[PDB]
Design a protein around this ligand. Sequence first.
Ligand code: FMN
Length: 147
Amino acid sequence: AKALIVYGSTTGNTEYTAETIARELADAGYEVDSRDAASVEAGGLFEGFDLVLLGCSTWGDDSIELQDDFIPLFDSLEETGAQGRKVACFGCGDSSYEYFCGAVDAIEEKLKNLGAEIVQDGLRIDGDPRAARDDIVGWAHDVRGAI
Ligand SMILES: Cc1cc2nc3c(=O)[nH]c(=O)nc-3n(C[C@H](O)[C@H](O)[C@H](O)COP(=O)(O)O)c2cc1C
């Protein structure tokens, strides 16, 4: 399996999360490409992968705002080759906000409309992901077992 992990992270939390998932798929024998959203170009980005994992933190407080580097990508999602692709989403947030990881929910909804296949319910981390490392390892294992 070739897996691509694309993340948006402003304070490094979602990035730490992505690195952790990368390592677990890599340890498992997958070939893993991990890229910060700041640096990708959307056209045909998902072509050639068996699994695509998209990570993004939630901002805005009063409304949902995706992490900044991720916006350009989200906007161009239909140009990715997501139709019929196996995907799963993850993200960091804080449950004291009214839309707790709303970024995850928007990205899943859009992926569904494009015809991607969501292989597992998204990983929504509340707080410091270093305190939820077992939950992240756990999710990475359930995704592998679903493709
Ligand atoms: C000003 C502000 C607004 C935030 N707004 C939201 C929000 O609407 N929903 C949410 O779940 N988390 C929200 N969070 C918390 C971040 O998503 C959380 O800190 C996450 O760990 C940051 O991830 P990152 O470093 O990868 O960008 C906010 C944080 C700040 C400081």
